[PDB]
Every structure is written in structure tokens, then in C-alpha cells.
Paper text:
Tau amyloid accumulation is a prevalent pathological feature observed in various neurodegenerative diseases such as Alzheimer’s disease (AD), corticobasal degeneration (CBD), globular glial tauopathy (GGT), familial frontotemporal lobar degeneration (FTLD), chronic traumatic encephalopathy (CTE), Pick’s disease (PiD), argyrophilic grain disease (AGD), and progressive supranuclear palsy (PSP), collectively termed tauopathies. Our research uncovers that the widely used [name] mouse model expressing FTLD-associated human [name] mutant Tau, develops amyloid fibrils whose structure is notably different from those in human brains diagnosed with non-hereditary tauopathies.
After helical reconstruction, we obtained a three dimentional (3D) density map with an overall resolution of 3.3 Å. The fibril comprises a single protofilament with a crossover distance of ~633 Å. The fibril core encompasses residues 274–329 (residue numbering based on the 2N4R Tau), which include the C-terminal lysine of R1, the entire R2 and 24 amino acids of the succeeding R3. Yet, when overlayed with the five ex vivo 4R Tau fibril structures, including GPT, GGT, AGD, CBD and PSP folds, a part of the [name] Tau (residues 297–311) that displays a U-shape, exhibits a similar structure to them. Instead, the [name] mutation establishes pronounced hydrophobic interactions with L282 and L284, which together with hydrogen bonding between the side chains of residues 286–299, attract the N-terminal segment (residues 274–299) to the U-shaped motif forming in the unique [name] fold.
Numbering used by the authors:
A (entry chain B), B (entry chain A), C (entry chain C): 274 to 329
């Protein structure tokens, strides 16, 4: 048995000039909030040159 | 048995000049909020040159 | 047995000049909110040149 009372709460976003990259920004749960954040990442930024040559 | 009462809550977005990339921004759940965030990523940015040559 | 009462809630978007890329922006659930966010990504940005040559 649980009994919760959420009265007069404030979760308010006000922005003027803002660039963002935000995943889970504003979340409100009545009785519970579970968050599982497991991002995998296998990325590559490669550059391959064979026999480069620079001459003045 | 659960008993919840969500009265007078505020989740309000107000923006003026804002660029964003936001996945899960404003979420409100009556009794529970589960979030599973598991993005996979296998990306490539490659560049391959064989026998580059620069001469003045 | 569950008993929830969501009275006078506020989830309001007000924007003036805003560019965005937002996936799950404003979501309200009566009793529960489940979110499974599992985007896969196998992208390529490649460039291949064989025997480049620059001469002044």
C-alpha cells in the first residue's frame, strides 16, 4: 500500500537563446521514475593514404 | 493498492530563439515512468587516397 | 487496484523562433508511460580517390 500526494509542483522550462542536445530533459512521474541509459557506440573516423608526397 | 493524486503540476516549455536536438523532452506519467534508452551506433566517416602527390 | 487523479496539469509548448529536431517531445500518460528508444545506425560517409596529383 502506497499513498502519494503531489500538489503544487514546478517543472518549468524557460529559455531565451539556447542551443542544446539533451536526451531526457523534463520527466515527472507520479509514483516512480526508472531510467535505463545504455547507449552503445562503435563509430570510426578513419583516413588512409598510401605514399603521400610533398615537394617544394 | 496504490493511491496517487497529482494536482496543480507545471511542466511548461517556453522558448524564444532556441535550436535544439532533444529526444525525450517533456514526459509526465500518472503513476510511473519507465525509459529505456539504448541507441546503437555503427557509423563510419572514411577517406582513402592512394599515392597522393603535391608539387610546387 | 490503483486509483489516480490527475487534475489541473500543465504541459504546454510556446515557442517564438525555434528550429528543432525532437523525437518524443510532449507525452502525457494517465497511469504509466513506457518508452523504449533503441535506434540503430549503420551509416557511411566515404571518399575514395586513387592517385591524386596536384602540380603548380
Amino acid at each position: 500500500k502506497v499513498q502519494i500526494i503531489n500538489k503544487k509542483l514546478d517543472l518549468s522550462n524557460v529559455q531565451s537563446k539556447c542551443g542544446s542536445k539533451d536526451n531526457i530533459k523534463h520527466v515527472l512521474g507520479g509514483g516512480s521514475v526508472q531510467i535505463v541509459y545504455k547507449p552503445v557506440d562503435l563509430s570510426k573516423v578513419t583516413s588512409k593514404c598510401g605514399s603521400l608526397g610533398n615537394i617544394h
